[PDB]
Design a protein around this ligand. Sequence first.
Ligand code: SAM
Ligand code: MG
Ligand code: MG
Ligand code: MG
Lengths: 55, 54, 97, 140, 338, 95
Amino acid sequence: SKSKNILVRMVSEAGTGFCFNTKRNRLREKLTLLHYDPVVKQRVLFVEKKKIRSL
Amino acid sequence: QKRREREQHIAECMAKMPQMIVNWQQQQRENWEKAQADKERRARLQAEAQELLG
Amino acid sequence: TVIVERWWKVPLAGEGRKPRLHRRHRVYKLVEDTKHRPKENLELILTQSVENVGVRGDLVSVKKSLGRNRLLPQGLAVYASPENKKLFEEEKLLRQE
Amino acid sequence: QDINDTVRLLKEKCLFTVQQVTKILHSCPSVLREDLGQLEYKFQYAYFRMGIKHPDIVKSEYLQYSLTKIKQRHIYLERLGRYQTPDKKGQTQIPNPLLKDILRVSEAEFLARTACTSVEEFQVFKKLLAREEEESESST
Amino acid sequence: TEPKFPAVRLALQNFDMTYSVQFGDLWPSIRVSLLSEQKYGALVNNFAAWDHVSAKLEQLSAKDFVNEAISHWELQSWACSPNLRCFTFDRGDISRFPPARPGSLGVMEYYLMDAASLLPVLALGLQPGDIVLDLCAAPGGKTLALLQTGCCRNLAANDLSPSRIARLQKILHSYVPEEIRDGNQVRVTSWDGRKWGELEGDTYDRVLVDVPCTTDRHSLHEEENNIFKRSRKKERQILPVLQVQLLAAGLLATKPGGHVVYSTCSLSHLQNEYVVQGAIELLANQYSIQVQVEDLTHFRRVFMDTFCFFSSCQVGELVIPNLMANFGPMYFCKMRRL
Amino acid sequence: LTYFSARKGKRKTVKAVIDRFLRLHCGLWVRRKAGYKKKLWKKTPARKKRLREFVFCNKTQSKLLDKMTTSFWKRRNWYVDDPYQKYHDRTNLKV
RNA sequence: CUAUGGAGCUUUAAUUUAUUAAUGCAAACAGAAACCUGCAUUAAAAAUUUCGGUUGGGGCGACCUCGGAGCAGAACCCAACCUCCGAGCAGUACAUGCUAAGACUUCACCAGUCAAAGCGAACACUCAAU
Ligand SMILES: C[S@@+](CC[C@H](N)C(=O)[O-])C[C@H]1O[C@@H](n2cnc3c(N)ncnc32)[C@H](O)[C@@H]1O
Ligand SMILES: [Mg+2]
Ligand SMILES: [Mg+2]
Ligand SMILES: [Mg+2]
């Protein structure tokens, strides 16, 4: 029951405060995705901020 | 005041958002190119090893 | 002095009626013990010469453990009551005259 | 108060006779300097994992030695198979090496007579046991 | 916890009772090494930045014992399986390799495996453009080495347990790039190993059989699913029959002139040598198949510098655990089918 | 359930149902979905969408809550700017 | 054999130090000390309560959730105990966004599943369980 992946939180770089949770490999770099922001009604960058839990 | 500060912060971030997006895409493309260049270098080293074997 | 507070809320009784107490209202929690609080200084007026202050009529704040055991019991000092301070300012005025 | 606490630990927690406590104080004076927790750990290690009794420990002066070297040599012999911890019945399938030989002699003589192994192997085991002990302390 | 007589203690008692007469005066050192932590070796992923990770390990002061053995091959004088890199620390060292990190290629740099497990792969003597069978492949400690060698166009790895099959597939996804495994170059399956003698007879050139066995190192530490449990006593008793059947099945599967490497992670002669002898006798009796066990003394002498061998083995070669070199326990026999 | 209180001799109300359920004056009961805030990272967007809705209760549960709550909660209210004001009455309902 | 019925005894069963004793700090004096009070740490001696089911010996073990096969041949359901193999994951996107007709459902409920159109983008993710 080893935990290969962890759940981490991505916040928008647009400053809207929007954020969402996604799973990633522990042995990996911090993620910088391009995700839709409902506040600005378009797609913006999201950077990893905090590790939530291991799964 | 709080609403205005929120709006101006959003505007300031979105002003430079396209530059951040294009810089990130350029960084990803350069990382992929560097990885492929390392693949080619590894293939060259394998060819050199084959030359040494022969 | 120990101070306690009930763990459970007591329902309001109103005016002129005593509250109704329950067994759960006997459960208390220790808010604070006064004996562990920082000490204070007792303020008094001297009558004779003392080592700290040797002039009669000077208001001095000294530790209670000494003021209550040496100065007051032996008559070496008196309380800083308004009557006492008035009577001492009277003799101060007489001296200045 | 420190001496009172130490002697109360010896008499009540460790359950030593008064004469045994007097002999321990006379023979191993570093016990007073030693803290209570480590002393109790040493005594219970000897009592359970080695199966030695109060007269034997007070006669062999086990408490004066370093817990680190005691652990190293005892665990080395136990993993070798030379030392077998006494069971519930008190019986041991093999004879046990004497406490005097395991502790009081040098490392060279200890390896030559009991371990019958190489000094390099002993040093490697010392490193491994130190790592295991520090990992156990971190886990606890 | 368990009520009475835990499986680890039962395994230790059995090993004492047997090896005290099976080994003589090596049992103390063997027991100490088994009870102590094992040394790890770093297998370089040749598909990744092998040169960079080799530089990193050499800065970590690890040495390429495989390259040292390659140098000593001619010094002592089928050669061995080429294109392999494994790094271990000096004799008596306790330093451990840091956990592997992904490279720029997306595949992890190296795999931490027991060095003795790499000996059967080297003894198998792989050649370019070969066909490889791997019985009891999962979790894939040796199949990873086979793929790092990369001398096999078709590799057929089989293991009965779906859980270990899934673990092997995860390892393959982590290490091997997807383009190699997309085709039929790698075929991972979950079926009984005794079937291959009829499913594919005289088909595969190189075959590696690592039968299930009472692994002493795992038995003395792990307390979950041990061969020395009371529920598994029947399996432990029946184990030699399964081992000899699997070896016979592998010998049937391999082609005439092909090579078979039988390996086991234990020290008992009953499950090391008698299994091989029973397999060859069964081949002679039932199916009239002849095999020749090759001599691996030349193989042993090269690695005597960084490995400890027992010099009283009738057929194969056995590496015993030691404090200076905690690799093992391992045993392997190489045989060509005629 | 307290059918007769010891201080007033009148039926009491369970506060769990009051805290968990909303009653419309027409007789319907509106509730939440169990687990609409639990482990959302392993649930599909459609599943979360249907989990974060407000649903009605059937006849048996409605009668149970009717018995477990007193008549004060079944009165008609005239709150100013009530989100559920239009849902208190049924329209075009036959039998 | 049953009771989500008792009681006695034991203990490294769960929850406590109310109590006693010994320490430490605070308080109070002396100048150091003792008694008392409060707050903490140790023990000692105790107080309340409890024995989840299956496998009939009994131990020794195993089992309790979900998926598949032997299991009801052709809409659905249906063999409990039993025999066996697995699962309590992984991998790829980052619109794996937002709302909304009409439906299915493991025989109740709780849950669970599919989905037209519409807004917004581009030119309802694979997997039996997980
Ligand atoms: C000892 S492990 C070998 C692991 C791997 N080959 C290595 O060297 O690192 C053998 C595995 O084969 C599987 N196995 C057992 N019996 C088998 C059989 N009869 N046929 C195929 N695989 C079997 C078991 O699940 C066991 O985990
Ligand atoms: Mg019942
Ligand atoms: Mg009670
Ligand atoms: Mg239904």
